[PDB]
Amino acid sequence: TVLAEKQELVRHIKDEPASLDPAKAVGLPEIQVIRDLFEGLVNQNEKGEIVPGVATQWKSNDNRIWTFTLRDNAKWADGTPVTAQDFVYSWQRLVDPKTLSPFAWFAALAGINNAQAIIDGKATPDQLGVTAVDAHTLKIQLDKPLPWFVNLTANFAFFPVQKANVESGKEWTKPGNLIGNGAYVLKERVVNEKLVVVPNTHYWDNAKTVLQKVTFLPINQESAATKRYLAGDIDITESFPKNMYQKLLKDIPGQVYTPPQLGTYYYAFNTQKGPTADQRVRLALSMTIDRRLMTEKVLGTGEKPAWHFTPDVTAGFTPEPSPFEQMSQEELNAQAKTLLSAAGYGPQKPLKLTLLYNTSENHQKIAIAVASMWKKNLGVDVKLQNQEWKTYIDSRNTGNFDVIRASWVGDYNEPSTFLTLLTSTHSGNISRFNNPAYDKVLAQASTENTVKARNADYNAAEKILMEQAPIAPIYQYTNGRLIKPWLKGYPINNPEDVAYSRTMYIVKH
């Protein structure tokens, strides 16, 4: 009675998705779509709490051996059942060296038995600690107790894929070929323009799905996206131009949202070669970024300075104060000069750097401003390069850029999601930071069984990141979005921004 006749949605995503295969996805452009096409053992509600997915229950006596009960009537988009074996197959495939998954390490973070040996080729994938006891009963064996293990199963990397589909060949993820178990099915795609999905009528909870079509529109120039939103072509954006914020608040109050998100923006230094291999160069660079200037003037949509890597909002985290947070920029800038001269740069040998970022107005403005801070305080010159998301994600692992722009949004709500990114066994370690003390302190944290004791080690880890500056944290994210008043059910207050079109609906407008 309150619902519109046409239950169709146009959703903006910032970039063209790199891959719709859960085991080859790495960032939010893909991931946003994958959550409509596939479904894990569990989902997240709007508060970020764990709720039933394929599983209706999950039990553990010791937080090490976990048993999931699956629903009888979970289905793939081809009407076949979703089974425990599907998961066995999909998680072996995640760790299988043949897959080259950029999330293989996630199975090791979970502590699933034998994950690291399999990733390293020392054990076969059937040695993984995951068993189908029957079609509806999946039993997982972890190395260590992990109270939040179930949370990890809401993460895309643990979504099931269908073997027969996967084994039909390299076009399996094309429109009309891709068979997943989520609320929607891929109907149409044109590269760089649109992805269109309609409901999987076999999805167990299809009775509740409202939206009959959702079109995702990738547009990496935030101005062009907001322009289409104001014109009425887009019902919800991802981000918006920072310089339009006050005018947006003014013209469309109620549609502008900027809650705190579990993610951090940062620059990665090459710790392995070039000038950035010297700890003093890195520290000078990081100290010279004026974080309150950035968040106040260049951003101003509620972002906070990142003095530590892990976001303040992260459940279980009580940071110790940083000594940079308490200094003035003047002090910071002068120490930075001292450090760089000790490194041996100045008029006698000026510092030249390359920086990669992925195409975006925001990243371009932040790069210009960082480069200005460095020019001005340290006499550094930076050659900028921009590349679209899908190309950036490979160029950055090439060892070729002194500075690389990036973010990390948490795969679950606990500090290890952040701090493990800098361990030597983590594929997403862009700086190639390889510090045995650092690795060992996080391995210890994972054996601890109180929040306080874990937090002491996570603090020790953050200290090493301050001392060695392999990366420069810049800011803590907000989930900046424009949402039309008639779009309901978007989980705008989920700190991880985990959303499924199946919760959304359109009111008469």
Ligand SMILES: C[C@H](N)C(=O)N[C@H](CCC(=O)N[C@@H](CCC[C@@H](N)C(=O)O)C(=O)O)C(=O)O
């Ligand atoms: C998903 C994984 N944990 C991860 O963080 N991957 C990151 C990439 C994660 C990723 O897509 N960030 C987005 C986050 C944007 C947040 C959004 N509110 C905004 O304000 O724009 C980005 O940079 O635009 C990696 O591979 O580099």
Ligand SMILES: [Zn+2]
């Ligand atoms: Zn049965």
Ligand SMILES: [Zn+2]
């Ligand atoms: Zn069918």
Ligand SMILES: [Zn+2]
């Ligand atoms: Zn803090």
Ligand SMILES: [Zn+2]
């Ligand atoms: Zn409309």
